[PDB]
């Protein structure tokens, strides 16, 4: 909830390399990104397991902040 764009969120978790890929494939606002699954990541070309973990862990961290707030 505290990021202006998907690009800004990705750069905050050191995953900025995926920004273009997310925007081009239609995961283009913070709302679109919250429904992303591990399979969605795989189909977007995020095949490195550590990067999948980074991204899925952050998506979950952001959900936790929202349910708790």
């Amino acid at each position: 909830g505290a990021y202006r764009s998907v690009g800004e969120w990705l750069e905050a978790i050191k995953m900025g390399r995926y920004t273009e890929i997310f925007m081009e494939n239609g995961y283009s606002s913070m709302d679109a990104v919250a429904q992303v699954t591990l399979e969605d990541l795989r189909r977007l070309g995020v095949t490195l397991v550590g990067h999948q973990k980074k991204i899925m862990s952050s998506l979950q961290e952001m959900k936790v902040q929202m349910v708790n707030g």
């Binding site: 050191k14 095949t47 490195l48 397991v49 550590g50 990067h51 999948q52 973990k53 980074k54 862990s57």
Partner: protein, 64 residues
């Protein structure tokens, strides 16, 4: 409140200098490290052949 396990592991391999890059790339526990191959080392930035071989040999040992 407890040492990061990937730091501890790389210390045991006498390659502690990569620990922060491992963790920053999401290789933050031994379950993830078990899946490491050449693309993962490339992204992390482990380039010296001896170090690459040492980590991949270690990864093989985690999968036993």
């Amino acid at each position: 409140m407890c040492t990061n396990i990937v730091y501890e592991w790389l210390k045991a391999l006498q390659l502690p200098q990569y620990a922060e890059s491992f963790v920053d790339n999401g290789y933050d526990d031994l379950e993830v490290c078990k899946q490491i191959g050449d693309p993962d080392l490339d992204a992390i930035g482990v380039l010296a052949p001896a170090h690459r071989r040492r980590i991949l040999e270690a990864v093989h040992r985690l999968r036993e």
